[PDB]
Amino acid sequence: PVWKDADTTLFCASDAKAYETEVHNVWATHACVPTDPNPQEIHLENVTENFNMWKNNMVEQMHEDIISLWDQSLQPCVKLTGGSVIKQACPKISFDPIPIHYCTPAGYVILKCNDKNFNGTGPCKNVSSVQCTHGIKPVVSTQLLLNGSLAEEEIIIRSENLTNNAKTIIVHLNKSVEINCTRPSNDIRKAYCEINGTKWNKVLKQVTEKLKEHFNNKTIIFQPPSGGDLEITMHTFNCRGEFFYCNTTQLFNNTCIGCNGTITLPCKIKQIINMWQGTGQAMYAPPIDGKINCVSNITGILLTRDGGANNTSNETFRPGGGDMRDNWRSELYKYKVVQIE
Numbered sequence: 500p501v502w503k504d505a506d507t508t509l510f511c512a513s514d515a516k517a518y519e520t521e522v523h524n525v526w527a528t529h530a531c532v533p534t535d536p537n538p539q540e541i542h543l544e545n546v547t548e549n550f551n552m553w554k555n556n557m558v559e560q561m562h563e564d565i566i567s568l569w570d571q572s573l574q575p576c577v578k579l580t581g582g583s584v585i586k587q588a589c590p591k592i593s594f595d596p597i598p599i600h601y602c603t604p605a606g607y608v609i610l611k612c613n614d615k616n617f618n619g620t621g622p623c624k625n626v627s628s629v630q631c632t633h634g635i636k637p638v639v640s641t642q643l644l645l646n647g648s649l650a651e652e653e654i655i656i657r658s659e660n661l662t663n664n665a666k667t668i669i670v671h672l673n674k675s676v677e678i679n680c681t682r683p684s685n686d687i688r689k690a691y692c693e694i695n696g697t698k699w700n701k702v703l704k705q706v707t708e709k710l711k712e713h714f715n716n717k718t719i720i721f722q723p724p725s726g727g728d729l730e731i732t733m734h735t736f737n738c739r740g741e742f743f744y745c746n747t748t749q750l751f752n753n754t755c756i757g758c759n760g761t762i763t764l765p766c767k768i769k770q771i772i773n774m775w776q777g778t779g780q781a782m783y784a785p786p787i788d789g790k791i792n793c794v795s796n797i798t799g800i801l802l803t804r805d806g807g808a809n810n811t812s813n814e815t816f817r818p819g820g821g822d823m824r825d826n827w828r829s830e831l832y833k834y835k836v837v838q839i840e
C-alpha cells in the first residue's frame with residue numbers, strides 16, 4: 500500500500516493496425532505500444548481516494564498527445580499562427596479516431612474510481628487500481644461530446660465550481676442520442692445533421708431536471724451562446740478530415756419540454772478554421788467528391804452559465820467548449836496517478 504499525489508510522464512497504448520493509412524492508426528503505430536495482452540485490476544479494499552479531475556496531469560499529457568497527433572496528421576495548406584505564414588501540402592487523408600490507453604511506468608499506478616455516481620471532484624469509495632486507463636477516442640469537438648463513454652446511472656454534472664460562472668459545466672449523459680451528419684455527393688460545403696427530436700428533447704428534459712437539482716430548483720433555460728467565433732457558437736467537429744460547423748440553435752431553443760420529428764441541422768464544411776491547439780488560423784483544401792457521412796453518439800454536453808442571475812428567477816445555460824482539455828477530462832475523470840511512496 501501507500502501512495503502520494505505525484506505525476507509522472509505517461510506512455511500510451513493502442514490497437515493501431517499497422518499497414519493502415521488511418522492517420523490515427525499511423526500515429527499510434529509509432530508513438531504507442533501494443534495493448535497490454537493481460538491487464539488486471541486490484542480492488543483497494545476499504546478505500547477513500549480523492550481524485551480532483553479538474554486538476555490532473557493525465558489530461559494535459561493527453562492534450563499534448565493530441566496536439567502532436569493532429570500536428571503531424573491533419574496538416575493545413577496554410578497555417579497562420581502568430582506572425583508567420585506556413586505554406587505546405589494538404590493531401591486529403593484518412594481520419595477516424597481510435598482508442599488510446601494511458602499507462603503508468605513502474606513505480607506509479609493509476610487509481611480508477613468505480614463509483615458510478617462520481618462527479619469528478621471529491622472523495623470516492625470504490626477505488627480500483629490499474630496500470631492503464633481504458634480505450635479512449637480523442638474526439639475533437641465543441642458544444643457536443645461525441646463517441647465517448649456514458650454515465651453508468653443518473654446524468655451527472657461535473658464542474659470545477661458550479662457557483663463560479665466561467666468554470667465550465669460538463670454534462671455526462673446516461674444514454675446515447677445519435678447524430679447523423681452528411682454532405683451529399685454531386686454547393687459542396689453545404690452539409691446537415693439529422694437528430695431524432697423525441698430522443699433529444701426527452702433526454703434534454705432529463706438533463707434540465709438534474710440541472711435544476713444542483714441549482715436550487717431554479718428556472719432552467721437553454722439558449723444559444725452569446726457571441727464568439729463559429730467554433731464556439733457551432734457544434735464543430737471533424738468528420739473524415741472535413742471540419743463540420745453545425746448550427747445547433749434548434750436544440751437549445753426549440754424548448755419542447757412534446758415536439759417530435761427528426762430534426763435536421765444546417766452545417767458548413769469550413770476551410771479557414773481558428774485552431775484549438777493554439778491561437779491561429781488553419782486553411783485546408785476544399786472537401787472531397789462524395790458522400791461525406793459520420794454517425795456519432797452524443798455522450799455529453801459542454802455548458803456555460805450566465806452570470807448576474809443572482810437576483811432573478813432563472814439560470815441560463817449556453818453550450819460552450821473550445822478547450823479540448825475539457826473533452827479529455829470528460830473521460831479521464833475516473834483516473835488518478837499515484838507514486839508508490
Ligand SMILES: C[C@@H]1CN(C(=O)N2C[C@H](CN)C[C@H](C(=O)Nc3ccc(Cl)c(F)c3)C2)C[C@H](C)N1C
Pocket residue numbers: 639640641728729730731735736737742772773774775776777778779820821822823824
Ligand atoms: C490556447 C487556447 C487556443 N484556443 C483558441 O484560441 N480557440 C479560439 C477559436 C475561436 N476563437 C476556437 C478554438 C476551437 O475550439 N477550435 C476547433 C477547431 C476544430 C475543431 Cl474540429 C474543433 F472542435 C474546435 C478555441 C484553444 C484554447 C483551448 N486554448 C486555450
Ligand SMILES: *[C@@H]1O[C@H](CO)[C@@H](O)[C@H](O)[C@H]1NC(C)=O
Pocket residue numbers: 542613614625627
Ligand atoms: C466496486 O467496483 C468494482 C468494479 O466493477 C466492482 O467490484 C463493484 O462494482 C464494486 N464493488 C463492490 C463490493 O460493490
Ligand SMILES: *[C@@H]1O[C@H](CO)[C@@H](O)[C@H](O)[C@H]1NC(C)=O
Pocket residue numbers: 618619620621622656657658661713
Ligand atoms: C461532487 O461530489 C462531492 C462529494 O459527493 C460534493 O462535495 C460536490 O459538491 C459535488 N460537486 C458537484 C459539482 O456536484
Ligand SMILES: *[C@@H]1O[C@H](CO)[C@@H](O)[C@H](O)[C@H]1NC(C)=O
Pocket residue numbers: 652653654673674705706708709
Ligand atoms: C438517466 O438519468 C436520469 C436522471 O436525471 C433518469 O431520470 C433516467 O431514468 C436515466 N436514464 C437512463 C437510461 O439511465
Ligand SMILES: *[C@@H]1O[C@H](CO)[C@@H](O)[C@H](O)[C@H]1NC(C)=O
Pocket residue numbers: 662663664806809
Ligand atoms: C452572486 O453570484 C454568484 C455567481 O457568480 C453566486 O455564486 C453567489 O451565490 C451570488 N451571491 C449570493 C449572495 O447568492
Ligand SMILES: *[C@@H]1O[C@H](CO)[C@@H](O)[C@H](O)[C@H]1NC(C)=O
Pocket residue numbers: 660662663
Ligand atoms: C467557487 O466560486 C465562488 C464564486 O466566485 C467563490 O466565491 C468560491 O471561493 C469558489 N470556491 C472555491 C473552492 O474556490
Ligand SMILES: *[C@@H]1O[C@H](CO)[C@@H](O)[C@H](O)[C@H]1NC(C)=O
Pocket residue numbers: 646647674675796
Ligand atoms: C452508441 O451508443 C450505443 C448505445 O449507447 C452503443 O451500443 C454503441 O456502441 C455506441 N456507438 C459508438 C460508436 O460508440
Ligand SMILES: *[C@@H]1O[C@H](CO)[C@@H](O)[C@H](O)[C@H]1NC(C)=O
Pocket residue numbers: 679680681693794
Ligand atoms: C443518415 O442520413 C443519411 C442521409 O439522410 C441516410 O441515408 C442514412 O440512412 C442515415 N442513417 C442513420 C443511422 O440515421
Ligand SMILES: *[C@@H]1O[C@H](CO)[C@@H](O)[C@H](O)[C@H]1NC(C)=O
Pocket residue numbers: 729732733746748749
Ligand atoms: C443559426 O441559425 C439560426 C436560425 O435558426 C440563426 O438565427 C442564428 O443566427 C444562426 N447562428 C449562427 C452562429 O450562424
Ligand SMILES: *[C@@H]1O[C@H](CO)[C@@H](O)[C@H](O)[C@H]1NC(C)=O
Pocket residue numbers: 722748749752753
Ligand atoms: C432562438 O432564440 C431566439 C432568441 O434568442 C429567437 O429569436 C428564435 O426564434 C429562436 N429560434 C427558434 C427556432 O425557436
Ligand SMILES: *[C@@H]1O[C@H](CO)[C@@H](O)[C@H](O)[C@H]1NC(C)=O
Pocket residue numbers: 595596638645646736737738739792793794795796
Ligand atoms: C464516431 O464513431 C463512428 C463509428 O466509429 C464514426 O463513423 C464517426 O465518424 C465518429 N465521429 C467522429 C466525430 O469522429
Ligand SMILES: [Cl-]
Pocket residue numbers: 532533534535
Ligand atoms: Cl504494457
